[PDB]
């Protein structure tokens, strides 16, 4: 049988925003745990949480301080534990991420590693003297200025590909591979059963650390995911760790150019077992990061389709339309007005549940849950805001309207105002106040509402992943893109084991007529979204609705 993961349908949870269970405002574990019916109800396999231990929280908890406590906001090792247990009476699994680039500069082994020139952790991280009176080399970080920060206490630079107080771990040296092993098992003998690694491409370093040329100067990420032992290194992980486990492992991959994703996934390989990729969901974003660029429905397919197949026959994907980075799915994707939100929230969910791959659902997408009304840049917390600011406004390139209306559009915040639970007081978030504000909008848009109403997106995202479960053709199966530019219509075929199926998606706000391949024709329908009545057997075209999407199974 194909694995279990390949058929699993995730959903993502960033705790904080998920729901607060002592009124701090925070979303929590107990808060998770409280929730797993209304998950399981939805039928979610797999649960995919945000970081979730000890951290000064300087970046969003990827700054980790120590990999085997919790993150204190998020309550207790305990309450982690009960956590577990009421996934396993469910059936359910728990995917955690793994951020292994780097540590916290509080972690333990840092303030070791730091203390002098001779210690059992100086080569935990990467200690280099500078040259010509500055830093080693011209490695620029990620997060602005050089990637070499010098420490006093020794005289040295200590390397960070990302902030300051996120010094790289060095997989140079076995000892701390063997640490990181270790800890990995910490938490699958807890029962963790995925692990996506973070940043997985930038593990390995250039020996030597040499300059990078102007060429490179010029996409430093990818020369940064170019070390020469990174796929040495996910493979003796692979052997020492996951030969011994049903886990899953999935790799955030970016920066590299897109035909090295197969290094790692491709099974016979023996590195990770699916990919994150960001080429979907960045699709329309411009270079400056807070703007969007034109872009249709036959770019959409396209960047689907690229990454689809550079998978290829050995290879596995996952699928998002939404994280905890982006805007939301139906603001984004779909068009998230008045008259279209639920149709084409509902849309989206057929795309998302149909694709081949490993789908994600982005915690509130289920609800169709949109994009926040900004007012003011005094109400995003997002701190890449500010940076837009100074780089941006402060520099006079932009004017701050300019910088509202258009973060208002692409900023992660976007995702992370609370969970809309009912209609109470936040949205039933939370008793207390909401470390960010609840959406208005939440009087209409809640899970209590939409749970109980069997044409609600809640219950359209339901009855679809019911609908997948039953079919293994619409999460094993093949893929076929019946037009790559087409710009209105997005028509595709699953297949498996000779059944065939047809997924048509109108993106369009107004009818159109879809007409099938020549010679197929319409058997049974499964399901529709804002459509009056299925199409008749051995229909050869169908007239869609605005934005109506279906699931057929062809003769
Ligand atoms: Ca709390």
Same mark, same amino acid.
């Given at each position: 049988?194909?694995?279990?993961?390949?058929?699993?349908?995730?959903? /993502?949870?960033?705790?904080?925003?998920?729901?607060?269970?002592?009124?701090?405002?925070?979303?929590?574990?107990?808060?998770?745990?409280?929730?797993?019916?209304?998950?399981?109800?939805?039928?979610?396999?797999?649960?995919?949480?945000?970081?979730?231990?000890?951290?000064?929280?300087?970046?969003?908890?990827?700054?980790? $301080?120590?990999?085997?406590?919790?993150?204190? =906001?998020?309550?207790?090792?305990?309450?982690?534990?009960?956590?577990?247990?009421?996934?396993?009476?469910?059936?359910?699994?728990?995917?955690?991420?793994?951020?292994?680039?780097?540590?916290?500069?509080?972690?333990?082994?840092?303030?070791?590693?730091?203390?002098?020139?001779?210690?059992?952790?100086?080569?935990?991280?990467?200690?280099?003297?500078?040259?010509?009176?500055?830093?080693?080399?011209?490695?620029?970080?990620?997060?602005?200025?050089?990637?070499?920060?010098?420490?006093?206490? %020794?005289?040295?630079?200590?390397?960070?590909?990302?902030?300051?107080?996120?010094?790289?771990?060095?997989?140079?040296?076995?000892?701390?591979?063997?640490?990181?092993?270790?800890?990995?098992?910490?938490?699958?003998?807890?029962?963790?059963?995925?692990?996506?690694?973070? %940043?997985?491409? %930038?593990? $390995?370093?250039?020996?030597?650390?040499?300059?990078?040329?102007?060429?490179?100067?010029?996409?430093?990420?990818?020369?940064?995911?170019?070390?020469?032992?990174?796929?040495?290194?996910?493979?003796?992980?692979?052997?020492?760790?996951?030969?011994?486990?049903?886990?899953? %492992?999935?790799?955030?991959?970016?920066?590299?150019?897109?035909?090295?994703?197969?290094?790692?996934?491709? $099974?016979?390989?023996?590195?990770?077992?699916?990919?994150?990729?960001?080429?979907?969901?960045?699709?329309?974003?411009?270079?400056?990061?807070?703007?969007?660029?034109?872009?249709?429905?036959?770019?959409?397919? /396209?960047?689907?389709?690229?990454?689809?197949?550079?998978? *290829?026959?050995?290879?596995?994907?996952?699928?998002?339309?939404?994280?905890?980075?982006?805007?939301?799915?139906?603001?984004?994707?779909?068009?998230?007005?008045?008259?279209?939100?639920?149709?084409?929230?509902?849309?989206?969910?057929?795309?998302?549940?149909?694709?081949?791959?490993?789908?994600?659902?982005? /915690?509130?997408?289920?609800? *169709?849950?949109?994009?926040?009304?900004?007012?003011?840049?005094?109400? +995003?917390?997002?701190?890449?805001?500010?940076?837009?600011?100074?780089?941006?406004?402060?520099?006079?390139?932009?004017?701050?309207?300019?910088?509202?209306?258009?973060?208002?559009?692409?900023?992660?915040?976007?995702?992370?105002?609370?969970?809309?639970?009912?209609?109470?007081?936040?949205?039933? +978030?939370?008793?207390?106040?909401?470390?960010?504000?609840?959406?208005?909008?939440?009087?209409?848009?809640?899970?209590?509402?939409?749970?109980?109403?069997?044409?609600?997106?809640?219950?359209?995202?339901?009855?679809?992943?019911?609908?997948?479960?039953?079919?293994?053709?619409?999460?094993? *199966?093949?893929?076929?893109?019946?037009?790559?530019?087409?710009?209105?219509?997005?028509?595709?075929?699953?297949?498996?084991?000779? =059944?065939?199926?047809?997924?048509?998606?109108?993106?369009?706000?107004?009818?159109? $007529?879809?007409?099938?391949?020549?010679?197929?024709?319409?058997?049974?329908?499964?399901? =529709?979204?804002?459509?009056?009545?299925?199409?008749?057997?051995?229909?050869?075209?169908?007239?869609? /609705?605005?934005?109506?999407?279906?699931?057929?199974?062809?003769?």
């Amino acid at each position: 049988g194909a694995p279990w993961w390949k058929s699993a349908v995730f959903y /993502q949870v960033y705790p904080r925003s998920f729901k607060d269970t002592n009124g701090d405002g925070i979303g929590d574990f107990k808060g998770l745990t409280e929730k797993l019916d209304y998950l399981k109800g939805l039928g979610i396999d797999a649960i995919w949480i945000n970081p979730h231990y000890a951290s000064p929280n300087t970046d969003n908890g990827y700054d980790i $301080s120590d990999y085997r406590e919790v993150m204190k =906001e998020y309550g207790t090792m305990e309450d982690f534990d009960r956590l577990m247990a009421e996934l396993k009476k469910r059936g359910m699994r728990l995917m955690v991420d793994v951020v292994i680039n780097h540590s916290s500069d509080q972690h333990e082994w840092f303030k070791s590693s730091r203390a002098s020139k001779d210690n059992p952790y100086r080569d935990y991280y990467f200690w280099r003297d500078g040259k010509d009176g500055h830093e080693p080399n011209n490695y620029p970080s990620f997060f602005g200025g050089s990637a070499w920060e010098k420490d006093p206490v %020794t005289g040295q630079y200590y390397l960070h590909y990302f902030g300051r107080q996120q010094p790289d771990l060095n997989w140079d040296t076995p000892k701390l591979r063997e640490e990181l092993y270790a800890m990995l098992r910490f938490w699958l003998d807890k029962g963790v059963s995925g692990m996506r690694f973070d %940043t997985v491409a %930038t593990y $390995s370093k250039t020996p030597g650390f040499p300059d990078l040329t102007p060429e490179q100067m010029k996409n430093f990420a990818e020369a940064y995911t170019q070390g020469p032992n990174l796929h040495r290194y996910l493979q003796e992980m692979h052997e020492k760790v996951f030969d011994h486990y049903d886990a899953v %492992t999935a790799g955030e991959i970016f920066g590299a150019p897109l035909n090295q994703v197969p290094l790692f996934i491709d $099974s016979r390989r023996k590195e990770l077992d699916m990919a994150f990729t960001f080429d979907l969901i960045c699709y329309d974003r411009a270079l400056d990061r807070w703007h969007t660029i034109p872009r249709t429905l036959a770019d959409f397919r /396209q960047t689907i389709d690229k990454v689809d197949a550079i998978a *290829g026959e050995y290879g596995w994907n996952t699928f998002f339309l939404g994280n905890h980075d982006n805007p939301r799915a139906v603001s984004h994707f779909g068009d998230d007005r008045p008259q279209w939100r639920e149709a084409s929230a509902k849309a989206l969910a057929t795309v998302t549940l149909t694709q081949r791959g490993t789908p994600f659902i982005f /915690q509130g997408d289920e609800l *169709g849950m949109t994009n926040y009304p900004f007012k003011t840049l005094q109400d +995003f917390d997002d701190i890449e805001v500010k940076g837009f600011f100074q780089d941006y406004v402060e520099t006079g390139k932009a004017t701050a309207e300019e910088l509202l209306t258009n973060v208002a559009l692409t900023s992660r915040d976007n995702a992370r105002t609370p969970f809309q639970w009912d209609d109470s007081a936040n949205a039933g +978030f939370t008793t207390g106040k909401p470390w960010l504000k609840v959406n208005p909008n939440y009087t209409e848009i809640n899970a209590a509402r939409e749970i109980g109403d069997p044409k609600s997106v809640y219950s359209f995202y339901r009855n679809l992943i019911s609908i997948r479960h039953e079919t293994p053709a619409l999460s094993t *199966g093949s893929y076929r893109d019946i037009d790559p530019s087409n710009a209105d219509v997005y028509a595709y075929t699953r297949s498996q084991d000779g =059944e065939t199926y047809l997924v048509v998606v109108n993106f369009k706000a107004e009818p159109r $007529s879809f007409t099938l391949p020549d010679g197929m024709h319409i058997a049974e329908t499964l399901i =529709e979204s804002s459509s009056p009545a299925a199409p008749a057997a051995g229909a050869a075209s169908l007239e869609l /609705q605005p934005w109506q999407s279906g699931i057929y199974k062809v003769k």
